[PDB]
Amino acid sequence: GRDQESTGFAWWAGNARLINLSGKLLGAHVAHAGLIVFWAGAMNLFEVAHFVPEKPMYEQGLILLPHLATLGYGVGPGGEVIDTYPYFVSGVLHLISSAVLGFGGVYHSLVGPETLEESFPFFGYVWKDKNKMTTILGIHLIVLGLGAWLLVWKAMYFGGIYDTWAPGGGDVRIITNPTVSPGVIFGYLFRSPFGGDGWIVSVDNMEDVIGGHIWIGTLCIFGGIWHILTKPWAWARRAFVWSGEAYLSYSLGAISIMGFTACCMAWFNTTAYPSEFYGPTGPEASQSQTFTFLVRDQRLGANVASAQGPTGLGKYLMRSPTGEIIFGGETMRFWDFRGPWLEPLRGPNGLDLNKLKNDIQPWQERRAAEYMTHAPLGSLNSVGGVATEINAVNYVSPRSWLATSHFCLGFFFFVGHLWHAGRARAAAAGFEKGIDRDNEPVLSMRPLD
Amino acid sequence: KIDISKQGLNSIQNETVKLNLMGKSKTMESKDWVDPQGRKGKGYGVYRFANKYGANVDGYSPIYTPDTWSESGDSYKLGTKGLIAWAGLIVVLLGVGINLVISTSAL
Amino acid sequence: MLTLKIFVYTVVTFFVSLFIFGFLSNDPGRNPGQ
Amino acid sequence: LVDDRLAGEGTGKILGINDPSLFWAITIVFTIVWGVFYVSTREIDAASDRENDDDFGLTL
Amino acid sequence: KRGWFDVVDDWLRRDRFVFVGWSGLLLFPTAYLALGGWFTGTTFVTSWYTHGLASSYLEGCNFLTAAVSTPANSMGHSLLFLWGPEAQGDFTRWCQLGGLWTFVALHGSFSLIGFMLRQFEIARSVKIRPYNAIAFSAPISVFVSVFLIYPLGQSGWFFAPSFGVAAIFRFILFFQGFHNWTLNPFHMMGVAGVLGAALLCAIHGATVENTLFEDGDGANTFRAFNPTQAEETYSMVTANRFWSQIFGVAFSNKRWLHFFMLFVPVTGLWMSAIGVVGLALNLRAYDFVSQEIRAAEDPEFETFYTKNILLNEGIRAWMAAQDQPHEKLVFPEEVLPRGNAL
Amino acid sequence: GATGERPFSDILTSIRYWVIHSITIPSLFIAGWLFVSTGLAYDVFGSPRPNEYFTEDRQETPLITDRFNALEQVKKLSEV
Amino acid sequence: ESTSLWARFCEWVTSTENRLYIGWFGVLMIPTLLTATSVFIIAFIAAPPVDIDGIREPVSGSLLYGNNIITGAIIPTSNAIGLHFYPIWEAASLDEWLYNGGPYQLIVCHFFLGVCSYMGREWELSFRLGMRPWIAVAYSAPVAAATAVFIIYPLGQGSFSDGMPLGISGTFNFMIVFQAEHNILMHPFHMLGVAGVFGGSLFSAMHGSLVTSSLIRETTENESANEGYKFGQEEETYNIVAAHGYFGRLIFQYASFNNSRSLHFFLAAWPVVGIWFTALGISTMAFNLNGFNFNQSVVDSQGRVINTWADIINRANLGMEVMHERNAHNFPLDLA
Numbered sequence A: 001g002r003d004q005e006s007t008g009f010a011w012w013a014g015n016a017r018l019i020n021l022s023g024k025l026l027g028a029h030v031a032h033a034g035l036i037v038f039w040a041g042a043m044n045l046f047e048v049a050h051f052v053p054e055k056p057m058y059e060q061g062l063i064l065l066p067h068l069a070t071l072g073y074g075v076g077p078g079g080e081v082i083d084t085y086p087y088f089v090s091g092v093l094h095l096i097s098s099a100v101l102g103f104g105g106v107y108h109s110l111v112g113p114e115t116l117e118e119s120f121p122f123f124g125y126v127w128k129d130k131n132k133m134t135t136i137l138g139i140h141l142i143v144l145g146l147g148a149w150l151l152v153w154k155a156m157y158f159g160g161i162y163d164t165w166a167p168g169g170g171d172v173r174i175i176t177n178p179t180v181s182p183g184v185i186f187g188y189l190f191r192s193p194f195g196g197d198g199w200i201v202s203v204d205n206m207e208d209v210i211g212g213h214i215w216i217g218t219l220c221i222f223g224g225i226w227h228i229l230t231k232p233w234a235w236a237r238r239a240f241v242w243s244g245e246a247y248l249s250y251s252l253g254a255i256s257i258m259g260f261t262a263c264c265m266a267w268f269n270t271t272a273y274p275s276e277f278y279g280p281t282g283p284e285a286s287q288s289q290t291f292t293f294l295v296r297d298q299r300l301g302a303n304v305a306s307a308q309g310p311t312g313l314g315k316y317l318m319r320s321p322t323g324e325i326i327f328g329g330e331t332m333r334f335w336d337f338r339g340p341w342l343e344p345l346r347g348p349n350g351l352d353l354n355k356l357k358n359d360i361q362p363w364q365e366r367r368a369a370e371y372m373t374h375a376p377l378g379s380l381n382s383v384g385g386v387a388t389e390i391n392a393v394n395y396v397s398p399r400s401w402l403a404t405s406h407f408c409l410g411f412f413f414f415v416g417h418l419w420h421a422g423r424a425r426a427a428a429a430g431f432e433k434g435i436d437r438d439n440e441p442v443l444s445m446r447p448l449d
Numbered sequence B: 001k002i003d004i005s006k007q008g009l010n011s012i013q014n015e016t017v018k019l020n021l022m023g024k025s026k027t028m029e030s031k032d033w034v035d036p037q038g039r040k041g042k043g044y045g046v047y048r049f050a051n052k053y054g055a056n057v058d059g060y061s062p063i064y065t066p067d068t069w070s071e072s073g074d075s076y077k078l079g080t081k082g083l084i085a086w087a088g089l090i091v092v093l094l095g096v097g098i099n100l101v102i103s104t105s106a107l
Numbered sequence C: 001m002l003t004l005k006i007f008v009y010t011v012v013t014f015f016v017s018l019f020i021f022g023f024l025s026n027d028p029g030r031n032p033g034q
Numbered sequence D: 001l002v003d004d005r006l007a008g009e010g011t012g013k014i015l016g017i018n019d020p021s022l023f024w025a026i027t028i029v030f031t032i033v034w035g036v037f038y039v040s041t042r043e044i045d046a047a048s049d050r051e052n053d054d055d056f057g058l059t060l
Numbered sequence E: 001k002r003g004w005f006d007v008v009d010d011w012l013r014r015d016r017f018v019f020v021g022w023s024g025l026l027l028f029p030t031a032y033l034a035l036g037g038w039f040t041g042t043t044f045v046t047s048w049y050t051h052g053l054a055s056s057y058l059e060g061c062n063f064l065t066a067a068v069s070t071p072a073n074s075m076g077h078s079l080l081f082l083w084g085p086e087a088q089g090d091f092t093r094w095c096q097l098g099g100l101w102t103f104v105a106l107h108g109s110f111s112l113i114g115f116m117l118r119q120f121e122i123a124r125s126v127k128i129r130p131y132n133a134i135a136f137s138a139p140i141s142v143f144v145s146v147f148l149i150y151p152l153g154q155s156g157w158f159f160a161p162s163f164g165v166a167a168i169f170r171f172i173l174f175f176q177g178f179h180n181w182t183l184n185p186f187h188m189m190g191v192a193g194v195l196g197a198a199l200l201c202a203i204h205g206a207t208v209e210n211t212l213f214e215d216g217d218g219a220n221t222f223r224a225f226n227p228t229q230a231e232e233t234y235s236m237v238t239a240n241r242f243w244s245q246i247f248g249v250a251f252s253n254k255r256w257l258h259f260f261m262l263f264v265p266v267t268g269l270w271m272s273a274i275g276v277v278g279l280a281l282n283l284r285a286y287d288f289v290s291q292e293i294r295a296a297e298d299p300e301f302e303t304f305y306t307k308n309i310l311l312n313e314g315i316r317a318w319m320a321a322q323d324q325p326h327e328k329l330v331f332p333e334e335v336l337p338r339g340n341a342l
Numbered sequence F: 001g002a003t004g005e006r007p008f009s010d011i012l013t014s015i016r017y018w019v020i021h022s023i024t025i026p027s028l029f030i031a032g033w034l035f036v037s038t039g040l041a042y043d044v045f046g047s048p049r050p051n052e053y054f055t056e057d058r059q060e061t062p063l064i065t066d067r068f069n070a071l072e073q074v075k076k077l078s079e080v
Numbered sequence G: 001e002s003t004s005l006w007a008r009f010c011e012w013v014t015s016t017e018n019r020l021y022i023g024w025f026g027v028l029m030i031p032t033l034l035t036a037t038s039v040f041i042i043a044f045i046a047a048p049p050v051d052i053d054g055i056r057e058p059v060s061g062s063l064l065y066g067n068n069i070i071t072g073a074i075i076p077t078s079n080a081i082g083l084h085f086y087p088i089w090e091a092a093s094l095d096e097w098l099y100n101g102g103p104y105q106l107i108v109c110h111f112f113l114g115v116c117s118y119m120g121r122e123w124e125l126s127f128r129l130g131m132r133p134w135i136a137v138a139y140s141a142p143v144a145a146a147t148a149v150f151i152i153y154p155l156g157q158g159s160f161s162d163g164m165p166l167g168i169s170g171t172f173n174f175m176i177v178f179q180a181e182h183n184i185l186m187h188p189f190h191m192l193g194v195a196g197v198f199g200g201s202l203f204s205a206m207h208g209s210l211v212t213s214s215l216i217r218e219t220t221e222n223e224s225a226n227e228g229y230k231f232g233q234e235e236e237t238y239n240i241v242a243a244h245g246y247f248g249r250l251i252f253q254y255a256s257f258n259n260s261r262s263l264h265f266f267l268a269a270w271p272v273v274g275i276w277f278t279a280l281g282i283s284t285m286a287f288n289l290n291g292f293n294f295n296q297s298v299v300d301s302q303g304r305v306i307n308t309w310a311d312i313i314n315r316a317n318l319g320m321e322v323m324h325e326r327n328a329h330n331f332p333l334d335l336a
């Protein structure tokens, strides 16, 4: 290693001593990737070993297994786990590959070449060499595009992916006609983030997901090819700071945005995050509660359409601010919800009174009751229910865990982007270690008013 | 004003750690020194006014001075017989304690 | 109401374009460092 | 109906454009500012006493 | 030094790892006894016979729910000595009756007195000014008004805070429900003082750390300082210009800056103490009579103040039965205020 | 500098120190364990065991009503 | 000499000779903040009642409608609207716009953009003056707290009506309802935030008193020491060694800070981390991850429940829960 004597960086900032050491930096990155794969495999093995078939996935605190279920692995019609062997296979493969990755990282960090700019010119680089950095960026863009295309191939030729909107209940479908319309793809991208619109979180069928992935794979491959063959222009050289910490800050900001988007998608989406494996969402539980109370009160001989509440608005059915027929109560704020068990009862102008008066199905009622009781509310020590409940239920929704953790991560990485962007801009200018007593900039300016 | 030799940091084996504790670094006073990110040095060193005030804050109030350590304590006077007696006593006490914990509990 | 929307859109795009094209105009070079 | 309204909230339009006039306003203002910047970006660069070669920019 | 006083002063005011001083004789025993009493009460002593709860680790409570509980309301304002006419020398029954709370409080007050005296003595020995000793008056006033004056103006020690986390939370919620403590201007000044003190601390730390001087060649700037140096380590001119162009106003006097830093939280805490002293006699700024009259005459007038009033009413009605066992309040379920479907 | 006591770094890295304190700390730990397990903690400080919260006489929470007869009242309430 | 119109405009915008720095972030900051300020003042003075719960029960919050400073507020947007975008041009008339709670959304959006631009402008002036750019990082804690109470909580609860009102009594109502629904007092992140503010006050008073106690004599007794300090002077005005000696004899030697830079970094770091954690706690509780629930935890041998201070807190929460909205609920569970 090194020391503060010959570096100027303390032990709590020791990873900054390998900014200009290409081999050791590569070793550190490979070791970290091995750590990530190790966690994936170990967590998959931990979750597969603690899974019982008498309870749904969201009732047992699983977050990695529902990811494999949505890919159509070991699941059946209706969203019931049938086989649990592919999860074991995936976990074993990840855990074993982590060993190779960790060995590579340890080798490159301990006994590998310290600075690979003289023995391996192809892999060597300088942070200020724009062409080499752009070439590396293009290579990794090509790799990511290949990964997106690999995801696309699964839904088409290798058995497909789980579709929660499939006719006759959710099942593993095959996507034959993806939506590759420019108007459809641009509609999701340049949509408002507010209610009703929802930006890209509002994607409501797997055809749109597969079409967007085709688009993103093609774009990434083309951009990688473009960057391999070119170098930044004058307007780009005039606008950016060119150093390793600057590149790190850019990446930190990008992945902070990604983390916030992931949190929102986990909280709100139902297509890519089926409720069969993640439980009901926020609005879904409220809509289910109103639906089941309407059904129960209708079974007791009541007129749900003409029933009037304490405020005079409607106990079960009211009108949305645009005219659509929606559920009444405080769930009037969640009328944008759209779920597979509720859509069949919805007509062109909202809920159909005759359909919910004569054509409500027992499976719909069971889904509504289950999503009502398993609402995404809980406590830090995993106690289900509102904050004024008793210790009877040990449950916290998998959506809550992912949403909270990823919001925290996104905020902290935004703060990291701020820190590193500021430090890079200051260090490149040349005053990151303090002000110069001999030449203080403020002393040379005219005093203010 | 401050004598570095009288600060009690002369009994440290590791030269780099010794230099770290006095707030000194021979590498950094060179005009051609470059830190990991790639910034040249102005020859100040760790502290600009090291000659004016004697030493740094590290060389002013150290918290690890092996010179002031007691001459005894680096060797056990009781020797091997004391260690053997200690081993016997700790084995006996551990047995007695585990027996008492098991007996006083509900098995 | 459409006139208000057009006016607000014009104002917002004016200010955002000013921001973008000002930060694109060799901003890192405006520092007192030597 | 009793009155009239734009009726566009919660629809999912690209950039919220329901009328081409908004697109025209955005494009015209952006183009004006871009042209003003484009005329002067040559003079602005020359204030650094350096040429915009491959080594230009703030580097470390 | 030949006299008894002289030799005792020579030994007491010695240069040592732990300074004892003349005030140590009052500080160390009382502080040790208060800490030990709190730890013993939270670990072993219960609260079943005085409050009807469990407040110890022995009974199955964690760090948050363990506390030293106040005596029963029947005891009034009794000082509850170990030898008093209630415990009568019985240690176990003294612990069961709630005498450990008064023990801890009475020893803690004298420990606070001894600590301010120690601050004064150490300041005088080093020949500096006693502004640190002056600053402790705000915590001492807060402790005196909350733990002594407020219970002394109530039914008894039963309504004092209990030395615990969840007990303090219950005390806070009780103060909200019954006194409308959030609507007290003195509490508003206290909140402003505390938040402004935090603001000042953060902003001063950041401003000093980001206007440093280049006194070294290393990126670790903590090693470019020496306490005996003459020149200041940061640029006051640069800091002043930055904050003048960003905020509009800025400090130009270090002494005034640091006195303001001292002045803000002390004043906030003193104002809150005055408010609690006033609240000890149920002199609460609870309601606005004009708003109540307008809402009574007009069934359409509603503001957030009325909603807060309803919330306080619900808190009182639903907490009264268990929080005050001595009143023996039995409330039928149909008299408790309640909303629709909730 | 130093106020005239042995440095903590010197003491904590001593064979004598770790020979003396390989007995005292475990002895205190075992003493506390035996204090709790032998029932002394309940008897000294008067805390109720899990089976002594409610007696056959009263099935409600205790309440002390008299200030000067408090000793006798708490003696009666604690009766098993 | 600048000649182009754009070059002159850039030189003026990025000028360090202005009385108040403009910058490129100030270009975004000034109009948004002015818009929010104007709408806030006009609504606080003369706005009509706003239907906040969507149950046709308007709530007054304006001075002209029978309120004082303590009682006045800006009522959040209607519950019927939800998270939908409600700009001024989406209303049939200004009378309808003011009835549903438009000004709250307008002010909230403009204020969020303005505070983000304010932090950016802090960085910008730090760069232009030749400083180190982390005063902006310090400001991120209050920025995150404001975002959490104004944006993230409505985002997770599905409506802007669950947002914090722009008033005093409205703030107290927000706090009480938050406690009744999430048990915020039992949240470790709220405990960390409380520790942060209490420690910030402690350390601010401690530092101010220690610096004021070591002032070197440069005046007489008929004038203040502030007159003893001269702006722009080079020598230090107080005895760091004397203050360190006093503190190290007050507690013990190795507890005080001998390094002024380290002491000021600690002063900066404590409250910032505390507020970061409390804002993270609010944002986490937005997605219904409440605090510790030690209700009916202590149970005796026969199975009966022994109460605790946590149970008393639960009784208070039940009291303030069944009354936070009297007529807005038709079903037993508050799932939102």
Ligand SMILES: CCCCCCCCCCCCCCCCCC(=O)OC[C@H](CO[C@@H]1O[C@H](CO[C@H]2O[C@H](CO)[C@H](O)[C@H](O)[C@H]2O)[C@H](O)[C@H](O)[C@H]1O)OC(=O)CCCCCCCCCCCCCCCCC
Residues within 6 Å of the ligand: A192, A193, A194, A195, A196, A197, A198, A199, A200, A201, A202, A203, A204, A205, A260, A261, A264, A265, A268, A269, A270, A271, A336, A337, A338, A339, A411, A414, G083, G108, G109, G110, G112, G113, G116, G143, G144, G147, G151, G155
């Ligand atoms: C180009 C630059 C930006 C330009 C535009 C800027 C506008 C700024 C306006 C000012 C106000 C600030 C922004 C407010 C955002 C509010 C987001 C919201 O109400 O909701 C967020 C939306 C969620 O949309 C939801 O999407 C849902 C999707 O619908 C459908 O979703 C599924 C589809 O299958 C299901 O079928 C489901 O039933 C169905 O309803 C619904 O439509 C909901 O009504 C809808 O609200 O997420 C999303 O847009 C995805 C994630 C968005 C970004 C991250 C948001 C969280 C972080 C905030 C910022 C950082 C804070 C921390 C740092 C602080 C310090 C700096």
Ligand code: CLA
Residues within 6 Å of the ligand: E025, E026, E029, E030, E033, E079, E080, E081, E082, E083, E099, E102, E103, E104, E106, E107, E110
């Ligand atoms: C260091 C100082 C100190 C101080 C100030 C206190 C203060 C207090 N203690 Mg604590 N205490 C201490 C140390 C101290 N304690 C020690 C070392 C122990 C041993 C563990 C205790 C154990 C203890 C117990 C067990 C109790 C207290 C309690 C109290 C209160 C006692 C009330 C009383 O009537 O006092 C006595 C009154 C006085 C005024 C004494 C002063 C009289 C002067 C000196 C005249 C001397 C004249 C006399 C006629 C002649 C004697 C001389 C001759 C015998 C040689 C008071 C708040 C009580 C409590 O808190 O109740 C809730 C209680 O129960 N204390």
Ligand code: CLA
Residues within 6 Å of the ligand: A001, A002, A003, A010, A011, A012, A013, A014, A015, A016, A017, A018, A021, A024, A025, A027, A028, A029, A031, A032, A099, A102, A103, A106, A109, A110
């Ligand atoms: C995420 C993980 C991580 C990784 C991969 C690295 C990586 C690296 N660190 Mg950093 N570091 C980290 C976290 C990490 N660090 C943290 C948390 C801190 C704060 C304490 C630091 C502080 C720090 C300092 C102060 C320094 C480094 C340095 C180094 C580099 C040189 C290694 C070396 O010389 O000493 C390795 C020393 C040893 C011989 C220990 C070997 C133990 C091995 C590696 C354990 C892993 C083995 C595993 C159990 C089995 C794998 C085998 C396989 C077959 C399965 C290395 C690339 C050095 C540097 O700057 O280089 C120029 C250095 O000066 N780091």
Ligand code: CLA
Residues within 6 Å of the ligand: A141, A185, A186, A189, A219, A220, A222, A223, A224, A226, A227, A230, A231, A232, A233, A236
């Ligand atoms: C991994 C991510 C990635 C990254 C980090 C970069 C990074 C960079 N790109 Mg590359 N690029 C990528 C992927 C990426 N690119 C892809 C996928 C493509 C194919 C479209 C390109 C095509 C491309 C071109 C054509 C150019 C660059 C340039 C640059 C540089 C300028 C920075 C900049 O964006 O200005 C900051 C960003 C802006 C001012 C605004 C951009 C935001 C756009 C306009 C949003 C709307 C999207 C757009 C209309 C595309 C359609 C959407 C889609 C659905 C079809 C920088 C080195 C420039 C250059 O230097 O080339 C050598 C340049 O001229 N890139």
Ligand SMILES: CCCCCCCCCCCCCCCCCC(=O)OC[C@H](CO[C@@H]1O[C@H](CO)[C@H](O)[C@H](O)[C@H]1O)OC(=O)CCCCCCCCCCCCCCCCC
Residues within 6 Å of the ligand: A189, A190, A191, A192, A193, A197, A257, A260, C012, C016, C019, C020, D008, D009, D010, D011, D012, D013, D015, D016, D017, D018, G085, G087, G090, G113
């Ligand atoms: C993408 C290029 C970015 C270039 C650099 C930008 C730098 C920053 C500039 C300032 C940005 C903030 C102010 C913006 C104000 C104008 C926008 C506005 O108010 O729109 C508000 C309008 C609302 O539009 C509404 O639409 C309704 C129907 O849907 C009705 O028609 C309403 O009348 C209408 O107002 O929304 C939009 O214009 C949609 C914007 C979509 C943006 C997609 C960006 C995709 C690429 C980036 C992806 C990541 C984005 C960040 C995500 C994480 C965030 C934490």
Ligand SMILES: CCCCCCCCCCCCCCCC(=O)OC[C@H](COP(=O)(O)OC[C@@H](O)CO)OC(=O)CCCCCCCCCCCCCCC
Residues within 6 Å of the ligand: E246, E247, E248, E249, E250, E251, E252, E253, E256, G020, G226, G227
């Ligand atoms: C575009 C700009 C964006 C941000 C704008 C910010 C505007 C606010 C500025 C307020 C300055 C007022 C200072 C007065 C006093 C004054 O003149 O200050 C000036 C004072 C000068 O200090 P000196 O070192 O020169 O003093 C020397 C000594 O000898 C004094 O005796 O500096 C300070 O104390 C800074 C602390 C200001 C703290 C102000 C906080 C806010 C106050 C509360 C606001 C209530 C609003 C109610 C609305 C209904």
Ligand SMILES: CC1=C(/C=C/C(C)=C/C=C/C(C)=C/C=C/C=C(C)/C=C/C=C(C)/C=C/C2=C(C)CCCC2(C)C)C(C)(C)CCC1
Residues within 6 Å of the ligand: A031, A032, A034, A035, A038, A045, A092, A095, A096, A098, A099, A101, A102, A103, A105, A106, A109
């Ligand atoms: C350099 C460095 C570092 C780092 C490091 C790292 C990060 C590493 C990693 C590493 C890694 C990352 C590793 C890994 C490994 C792995 C392995 C070794 C595995 C194994 C496995 C197995 C053996 C399995 C088995 C099985 C099967 C087959 C089936 C089922 C069952 C079981 C599970 C049993 C540190 C920080 C120290 C610092 C200094 C420097």
Ligand SMILES: CC1=C(/C=C/C(C)=C/C=C/C(C)=C/C=C/C=C(C)/C=C/C=C(C)/C=C/C2=C(C)CCCC2(C)C)C(C)(C)CCC1
Residues within 6 Å of the ligand: A184, A185, A188, A189, A200, A203, A208, A209, A211, A212, A213, A215, A216, A239, C019, C020, C021, C023, C024
């Ligand atoms: C897959 C998928 C999809 C698709 C997607 C896509 C296709 C996307 C794209 C995306 C994109 C395409 C994005 C972009 C972005 C961008 C950005 C975010 C930018 C930024 C920028 C910046 C930040 C800048 C800055 C600046 C300025 C302004 C000034 C000067 C300086 C600088 C340059 C720095 C969908 C949804 C359909 C469905 C689902 C799935």
Ligand SMILES: CC1=C(/C=C/C(C)=C/C=C/C(C)=C/C=C/C=C(C)/C=C/C=C(C)/C=C/C2=C(C)CCCC2(C)C)C(C)(C)CCC1
Residues within 6 Å of the ligand: E032, E033, E035, E036, E037, E039, E040
């Ligand atoms: C009552 C009384 C008394 C007194 C007593 C005493 C003085 C005692 C003491 C006692 C004591 C003196 C105790 C203590 C205890 C302690 C403890 C129980 C501790 C614990 C700790 C912990 C649990 C820790 C934790 C942690 C960790 C591990 C990590 C980091 C953070 C912390 C540090 C928090 C007398 C007889 C005089 C008289 C009568 C009455």
Ligand SMILES: CC/C=C\C/C=C\C/C=C\CCCCCCCC(=O)O
Residues within 6 Å of the ligand: D017, D018, D019, D020, D021, D023
């Ligand atoms: C000289 C010809 C060369 C290039 C011109 C090419 C294409 C012009 C195409 C479209 C211009 C109008 C764009 C309108 C966008 C949509 C507006 C709306 O949604 O109302």
Ligand code: OEX
Residues within 6 Å of the ligand: A330, G053, G079, G157, G161, G162, G177, G181, G324, G325, G328, G334, G335, G336
């Ligand atoms: O609005 Mn305001 O507070 Ca959210 O929870 Mn449901 O809704 Mn209403 O109640 Mn609770």
Ligand SMILES: [Cl-]
Residues within 6 Å of the ligand: A328, A329, A330, A331, G328, G329, G330, G331
């Ligand atoms: Cl409802």
Ligand SMILES: [Fe+2]
Residues within 6 Å of the ligand: E204, E208, G207, G211
């Ligand atoms: Fe200071």
